[PDB]
Motif scaffolding. Structure first.
Motif, PDB file in Angstrom:
ATOM      1  N   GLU A  22       2.122  11.255   3.799  1.00  0.00           N
ATOM      2  CA  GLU A  22       0.701  11.223   3.289  1.00  0.00           C
ATOM      3  C   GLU A  22      -0.255  10.711   4.554  1.00  0.00           C
ATOM      4  OE1 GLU A  22      -1.500   8.372   3.202  1.00  0.00           O
ATOM      5  OE2 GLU A  22      -2.982   9.089   1.898  1.00  0.00           O
ATOM      6  N   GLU A  26       9.780   4.826   0.633  1.00  0.00           N
ATOM      7  CA  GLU A  26       8.295   4.473   0.281  1.00  0.00           C
ATOM      8  C   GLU A  26       7.672   4.583   1.735  1.00  0.00           C
ATOM      9  OE1 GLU A  26       7.311   0.861  -1.520  1.00  0.00           O
ATOM     10  OE2 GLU A  26       5.303   0.932  -1.086  1.00  0.00           O
ATOM     11  N   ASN A  46      14.702   1.636  -1.234  1.00  0.00           N
ATOM     12  CA  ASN A  46      13.358   2.044  -1.927  1.00  0.00           C
ATOM     13  C   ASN A  46      12.214   1.849  -0.534  1.00  0.00           C
ATOM     14  OD1 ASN A  46      14.696   2.220  -4.088  1.00  0.00           O
ATOM     15  ND2 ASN A  46      14.248  -0.042  -4.835  1.00  0.00           N
ATOM     16  N   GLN A  90      19.553  -1.642  -2.152  1.00  0.00           N
ATOM     17  CA  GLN A  90      18.598  -0.752  -3.094  1.00  0.00           C
ATOM     18  C   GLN A  90      17.101  -1.246  -2.713  1.00  0.00           C
ATOM     19  OE1 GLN A  90      18.123   2.455  -5.602  1.00  0.00           O
ATOM     20  NE2 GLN A  90      20.036   1.229  -5.284  1.00  0.00           N
ATOM     21  N   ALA A 131      -4.728   5.400   7.871  1.00  0.00           N
ATOM     22  CA  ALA A 131      -4.187   5.874   6.649  1.00  0.00           C
ATOM     23  C   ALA A 131      -2.633   4.983   7.096  1.00  0.00           C
ATOM     24  CB  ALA A 131      -3.544   7.112   6.821  1.00  0.00           C
ATOM     25  N   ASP A 181      -2.210   0.953   5.365  1.00  0.00           N
ATOM     26  CA  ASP A 181      -1.588   0.682   4.158  1.00  0.00           C
ATOM     27  C   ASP A 181      -0.122   0.655   4.402  1.00  0.00           C
ATOM     28  OD1 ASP A 181      -4.230   0.686   3.045  1.00  0.00           O
ATOM     29  OD2 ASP A 181      -4.273   2.791   2.753  1.00  0.00           O
ATOM     30  N   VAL A 182       0.419   1.346   5.187  1.00  0.00           N
ATOM     31  CA  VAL A 182       1.741   1.597   5.372  1.00  0.00           C
ATOM     32  C   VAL A 182       2.130   0.250   6.142  1.00  0.00           C
ATOM     33  CG1 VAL A 182       3.727   2.759   6.602  1.00  0.00           C
ATOM     34  CG2 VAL A 182       1.640   3.916   5.677  1.00  0.00           C
ATOM     35  N   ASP A 225      18.397  -6.661  -1.001  1.00  0.00           N
ATOM     36  CA  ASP A 225      19.853  -5.959  -0.957  1.00  0.00           C
ATOM     37  C   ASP A 225      19.739  -4.650  -0.550  1.00  0.00           C
ATOM     38  OD1 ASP A 225      18.064  -5.237  -3.005  1.00  0.00           O
ATOM     39  OD2 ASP A 225      19.720  -5.316  -4.669  1.00  0.00           O
ATOM     40  N   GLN A 235       9.270 -15.259   1.223  1.00  0.00           N
ATOM     41  CA  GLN A 235       8.354 -16.225   1.787  1.00  0.00           C
ATOM     42  C   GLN A 235       8.768 -16.746   2.891  1.00  0.00           C
ATOM     43  OE1 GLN A 235       7.607 -19.229  -1.088  1.00  0.00           O
ATOM     44  NE2 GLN A 235       5.995 -20.212   0.032  1.00  0.00           N
ATOM     45  N   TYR A 277       7.309   8.518   2.413  1.00  0.00           N
ATOM     46  CA  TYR A 277       6.332   9.080   1.799  1.00  0.00           C
ATOM     47  C   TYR A 277       5.088   8.628   2.370  1.00  0.00           C
ATOM     48  CZ  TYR A 277       9.020  11.114  -1.479  1.00  0.00           C
ATOM     49  OH  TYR A 277      10.214  11.961  -2.572  1.00  0.00           O
ATOM     50  N   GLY A 278       4.885   7.324   2.796  1.00  0.00           N
ATOM     51  CA  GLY A 278       3.590   7.058   3.495  1.00  0.00           C
ATOM     52  C   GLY A 278       3.419   7.422   4.758  1.00  0.00           C
ATOM     53  N   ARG A 288       4.985  -7.167   0.744  1.00  0.00           N
ATOM     54  CA  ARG A 288       5.612  -6.746  -0.652  1.00  0.00           C
ATOM     55  C   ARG A 288       7.226  -6.877  -0.602  1.00  0.00           C
ATOM     56  NH1 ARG A 288       2.019  -1.896  -3.385  1.00  0.00           N
ATOM     57  NH2 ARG A 288      -0.090  -2.771  -3.388  1.00  0.00           N
ATOM     58  N   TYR A 289       7.668  -6.251   0.360  1.00  0.00           N
ATOM     59  CA  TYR A 289       8.904  -6.267   0.662  1.00  0.00           C
ATOM     60  C   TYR A 289       9.782  -7.281   1.490  1.00  0.00           C
ATOM     61  CZ  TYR A 289       9.597  -1.790  -1.359  1.00  0.00           C
ATOM     62  OH  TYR A 289       9.530  -0.566  -2.307  1.00  0.00           O
TER      63      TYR A 289
END
Lengths: 269, 126, 544, 96, 96
Positions: free
Chosen positions: E20, E13, E9, E5, E78, E81-82, E3, E92, E16-17, E88-89
């Motif tokens: 970093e 993320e 998110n 939201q 680095a 990981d991003v 959706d 399947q 921020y990644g 995760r997002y």
């Protein structure tokens, strides 16, 4: 039943603390969640698979456990499993009676053989929390902006005396705590995954005495000017070596005993 | 006619989801025999929740008194598979066409199972 | 209680790297050490702190007076500007604070310099003469007159005028005093003589470290269980039997000790009578059982703990030593043994295979099997209560025991024939950290900074516990790299008192689990199935 | 090997071995059997619901009709076990 | 995303990644012989000056070759990981 903090087993990786808080407040009662923190493997962009939530009342925790045991918690096609936690997010007692706000705190020592107590320094609007599991009592004193935490263990206090401040013998409005050792002094020092319901984004470090006249270092007894306390004696009955007697005190002007040196309790030459 | 029969109680699920559209591995601990079981059950077709009790039986054939290779009215989760590994508290490894099953119990409880044989899986949720 | 590490210099991440931030308690301690405590008409300054007080977070203070001040005593003890190290200067200034008995004064004209021995093998500097020395018989008799010693010890720890080390008795000395090179720590203005301890033939004990490191060479748990059971059986009958009481008192604490209770134990009334001695016996038994519960202390009659020295003979090769000790009640009752030689009525030589270890030990290579050899030439010199280490060899024996030195330290000797000498493991290297030398003199503030910083990053007590827990947990203990790293960290922490090198205990190496035989009730307790667990179960079943 | 399935049989095999929840009935299985050299394995799924007749086949048995009866294969990295021409186990990896 | 939201998110993320990763690259760029006095465990008052000059790091990186290669390697390390957030997002049934 010892603590109200509950650990959630599995949560989706794409959720935020606000969404979980809203879900809990929808399934449970309104504003029944105190703190919620999701651990992260990075600074602010990688939450873990579990989270820890602290409730306000033990009945809410029991209801949440009952709902989780029946698999009635379904948040984004994930079943939330609840389990006990090791430590609370905030060292806050789960009791509406042990939380005292806006009370008068003063320190001192008995002056002479008579039932008299001299006040060195007086503080107003302090916060007192009584923790039974941790066996310690915290005193939050706000002085010139920054707040301080005074912790007194149950072993440092040798006797508890109930007294009064207004002079009425039928109204117990004071409590004297005879301390053998000294209390610990702390100091406050200066968000997406942590709600916390308050401004608790700080840490406590041990510092020296903050009083200008060093009243704490030269005082071996505390005083808690409280209200009438019809049911406060039951709360104060849990302190070790409690005296079930009524005693009266008289305030003595003892502001002269103030030493600005590093070594406080030495006599003046 | 039935080699193994016991009442099982589920303990936890691997996906822990309701609409994952994927096979869910179940972990049911047996009663009065102390046996641990792994099984892949499709929750979307056959619902199973944590805390429910179900019976499980294994027979070499579905016919009565012989005819290897009428128990359909009693049970409701009949399957067919083959046991391909017995050596490990002995444990079993039966594949129901890709659905792995692990039956780790006692050595004396699992002794009449031959290697590389066809066996059924009869299950009912009481 | 001891100040925790979080109360001083709490860690914080500022910038790219983690930078510690000093707390107000750190500044308070610095100010107290700098200004001093003013009690009445006095103001106490800072003089020095001993090595023992550094671990205990204690320091001496002296109030300045018109006749003598702190600087007067500081310059009278010696000149400390020669040492450019911070920790070393403090250690050498505070080492002259141990209790010692006064004796005669020796002048500076009766001194000599004798060369030492040093051998470099495989690019490693191995020195035999670290703190060894020589003494004559007349000087030994003169020293032993003011302290009341009948038998003249063959060796005794001595220190005078900044020197420190044990000296041995030789029958071919020139004069009463002899000095070596590697003994002068600092130049002192006085040469007062005093001794701390001469020799004590106390029976040895099997601590937790020894049992932990001996559970790998092949020693089974049956022998330890049987020995503990027979010890408990002997201790239990000590109460109602007077014969067992004297035997226990003459073989556990003090080989030759005269006491009021000891004399009455051999000849006295029934244990029911004489309540004054009965209560003392009961409280002694309670103390012994409490100590056994707290830590493993097995009483063995065929072992002692004594200091050792070296002789200028060179006849003993690598791995050959001479063992000699006094005769106890058990030795006198039956002196006919294969590994026991009755050289004299009071002194009996050993011919068995004796291993030598120190009190702290965390490495399997510390175990080294030494074969005792008897020689008339060595016995002619008259050595007693002193293990003779060989003068020549590849590496010194004290270095084999976790890099020890001959400074009057006790050694573990036991002439038991049931140990397994087949397995041998090379010892760990004794190479320490590089010394830190300053470019200027100490301004009396850096010593205070070092003293305060000793409270933080002090993991000496937790490394041993973590090593014990890890050895208890995994099999083939003291063989994996974790135990080797723990031993290295323990050695570095022990060396932290002399050289300012923090141990840097990692977070992932903490135990997080504690066995049953510990007082950590608040911490999670787990059931232990090792030899220590079996001993704890046996003692619990015996007491219950 | 020089010849390999290019992305299409690869994608189809990955889908038929990963899902494990889209069963095939008798009609579809028989229709797909016309393009396979070997015979039909047992359904292995007699009942999936209390009121579901017509026993169905699983996805991994469809891919098992391509292997000879005397073919044995083992890929420990992807937990792939093939015995007697039947694909017994497969977890993930898409490397075999 | 499922959706709006979840998309927000994921965007936060990712931002921020990336921040970093840029910080890690800037930290790794200090592994030179000119900052040996700053990298040592001592007392340096120029700790704030190393983080106050953020735009100078880019100019210093783009003018050198070894520094640029080190920055690229650190950024890839680095950013692995991003990239690891799509599992995760992502769903399947995602075709990609």
């Amino acid at each position: 039943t010892n603590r109200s903090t509950v650990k959630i087993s599995n949560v989706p990786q794409t959720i935020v603390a606000d969404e979980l808080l809203r879900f809990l407040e929808l399934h449970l009662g309104e504003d029944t969640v105190f703190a919620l923190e999701i651990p992260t493997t990075r600074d602010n962009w990688k939450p873990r698979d579990f989270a820890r939530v602290q409730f306000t009342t033990l009945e809410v925790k029991s209801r949440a456990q009952l709902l989780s045991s029946q698999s009635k918690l379904l948040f984004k096609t994930h079943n939330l499993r609840l389990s006990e936690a090791y430590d609370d997010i905030i060292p806050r007692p789960v009791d509406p009676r042990k939380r005292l706000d806006d009370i008068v705190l003063t320190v001192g020592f008995p002056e002479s053989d008579e039932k008299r107590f001299c006040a060195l320094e007086k503080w107003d609007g302090v916060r007192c929390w009584i923790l039974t599991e941790k066996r310690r009592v915290e005193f939050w004193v706000w002085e010139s902006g920054d707040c301080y935490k005074i912790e007194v263990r149950f072993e440092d206090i040798i006797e508890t005396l109930s007294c009064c401040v207004n002079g009425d013998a039928s109204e117990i409005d004071a409590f004297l705590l005879k301390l053998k050792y000294g209390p610990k002094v702390f100091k406050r020092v200066t968000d997406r995954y942590r709600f916390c319901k308050e401004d608790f984004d700080f840490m406590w470090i041990r510092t020296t005495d903050f009083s200008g006249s060093k009243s704490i270092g030269t005082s071996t007894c505390f005083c808690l000017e409280v209200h009438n306390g019809s049911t406060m004696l039951d709360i104060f009955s849990g302190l070790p070596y409690y005296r079930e007697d009524t005693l009266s005190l008289t305030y003595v002007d003892g502001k002269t005993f103030a030493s600005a040196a590093q070594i406080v309790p030495l006599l003046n030459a | 006619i039935i080699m193994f029969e016991d009442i099982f109680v589920v303990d936890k699920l691997d996906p822990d989801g309701k609409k994952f559209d994927k096979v869910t591995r179940v972990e049911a601990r047996s009663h009065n025999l102390e046996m641990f079981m792994h099984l892949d059950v499709n929750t979307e077709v056959y619902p199973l929740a944590v805390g429910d009790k179900f019976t499980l039986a294994m027979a070499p054939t579905l016919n009565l008194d012989g005819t290897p290779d009428t128990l359909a009215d009693k049970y409701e989760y009949i399957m067919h598979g083959k046991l391909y590994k017995i050596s490990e508290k002995a444990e079993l490894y039966v594949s129901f066409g890709g659905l792995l099953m692990l039956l780790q119990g006692d050595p004396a409880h699992i002794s009449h199972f031959e290697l590389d044989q066809r066996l059924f899986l009869l299950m009912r949720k009481l | 209680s001891k100040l925790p590490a979080n109360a001083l210099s709490v860690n914080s991440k500022e910038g790219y790297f983690v930078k510690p931030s000093r707390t107000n308690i750190y500044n308070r301690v610095l100010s107290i050490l700098g200004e001093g405590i003013t009690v009445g008409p006095k103001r106490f300054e800072f003089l020095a702190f001993s090595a023992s007080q550094l671990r205990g977070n204690s320091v001496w203070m002296f109030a300045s007076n018109e006749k003598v001040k702190a600087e007067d005593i500081r310059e009278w003890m010696g000149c400390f500007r020669k040492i450019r190290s911070i920790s070393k200067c403090a250690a050498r200034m505070g080492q002259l604070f141990s209790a010692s008995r006064q004796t005669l004064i020796v002048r500076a004209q009766d001194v000599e310099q004798i060369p030492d021995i040093e051998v470099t093998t495989d690019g490693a500097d191995y020195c035999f003469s670290d703190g060894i020395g020589k003494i004559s018989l007349a000087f030994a008799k003169q020293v032993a007159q003011k302290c009341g010693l009948s038998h003249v010890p063959s060796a005794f720890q001595i220190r005078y005028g900044g020197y420190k080390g044990v000296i041995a008795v030789d029958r071919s000395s020139f004069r009463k005093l002899s000095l070596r090179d590697s003994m002068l720590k600092f130049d002192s203005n006085n040469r007062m003589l005093n001794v701390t301890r001469w020799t004590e033939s106390m029976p040895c004990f099997l601590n937790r470290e020894i049992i932990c490191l001996l559970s790998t060479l092949g020693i089974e748990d049956a022998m330890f269980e049987a020995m503990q059971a027979v010890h408990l059986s002997m201790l239990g009958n000590m109460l109602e039997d007077r014969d067992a009481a004297l035997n226990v008192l003459q073989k556990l604490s003090g080989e030759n000790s005269k006491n009021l209770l000891v004399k009455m134990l051999l000849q006295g009334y029934a244990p029911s009578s004489e309540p004054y001695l009965s209560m003392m016996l009961r409280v002694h038994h309670e103390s012994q059982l409490s100590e056994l519960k707290s830590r493993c202390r097995i009483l063995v009659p065929k072992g002692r703990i004594l200091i050792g020295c070296m002789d200028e003979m060179g006849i003993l090769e690598y791995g050959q030593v001479y063992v000699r000790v006094t005769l106890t009640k058990a030795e006198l009752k039956s002196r006919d043994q294969s590994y026991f030689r009755k050289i004299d009525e009071e002194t009996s030589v050993v011919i068995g295979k004796v291993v030598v270890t120190k009190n702290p030990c965390l490495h399997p290579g510390d175990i080294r099997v030494l074969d005792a050899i008897y020689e008339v030439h060595f016995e002619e010199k008259g050595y007693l209560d002193c293990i003779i280490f060989p003068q020549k060899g590849e590496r010194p024996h004290p270095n084999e025991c976790s890099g020890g030195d001959l400074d009057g330290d006790q050694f573990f000797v036991s002439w038991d024939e049931k140990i397994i000498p087949s397995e041998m493991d090379p010892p760990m290297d004794y190479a320490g950290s590089r010394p830190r030398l300053m470019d200027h003199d100490v301004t009396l503030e850096e010593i205070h900074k070092f003293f305060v910083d000793y409270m933080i990053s002090d993991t000496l007590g937790v490394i041993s516990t973590a090593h014990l827990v890890h050895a208890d947990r995994d099999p083939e203990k003291a063989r994996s790299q974790k135990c080797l790293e723990l031993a290295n960290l323990h050695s570095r922490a022990v060396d932290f008192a002399k050289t300012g090198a923090p141990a840097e205990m990692p977070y992932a190496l903490k135990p997080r689990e504690f066995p049953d035989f510990l007082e950590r009730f608040e911490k999670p307790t787990y059931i232990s199935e090792s030899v220590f667990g079996k001993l704890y179960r046996a003692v619990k079943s015996s007491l219950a | 090997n020089l010849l390999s399935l290019g992305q299409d049989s690869l994608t189809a095999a990955y889908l038929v071995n990963v899902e494990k929840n889209c069963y095939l009935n008798r009609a579809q299985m028989q229709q797909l059997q016309m393009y396979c050299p070997f015979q039909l394995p047992p359904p292995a799924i007699i009942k999936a619901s209390p009121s579901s007749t017509e026993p169905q086949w699983t996805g991994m048995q469809l891919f098992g009709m391509l292997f000879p009866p005397g073919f044995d294969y083992t890929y420990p990295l992807n937990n792939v076990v093939v015995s007697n021409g039947e694909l017994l186990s497969f977890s993930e990896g898409s490397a075999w | 995303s499922s959706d709006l939201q979840s998309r927000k998110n994921l965007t936060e993320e990712i931002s921020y990644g990336l921040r970093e990763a840029e910080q890690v690259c800037n930290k790794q760029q200090l592994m030179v012989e000119s900052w040996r006095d700053f990298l040592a465990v001592n007392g340096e008052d120029k700790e704030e000056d190393s983080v106050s000059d953020l735009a100078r790091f880019c100019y210093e990186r783009q003018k050198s070759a070894t520094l640029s290669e080190l920055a690229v390697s650190a950024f890839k390390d680095a950013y692995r990981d991003v990239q690891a957030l799509a599992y995760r997002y992502g769903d399947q049934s995602n075709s990609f």
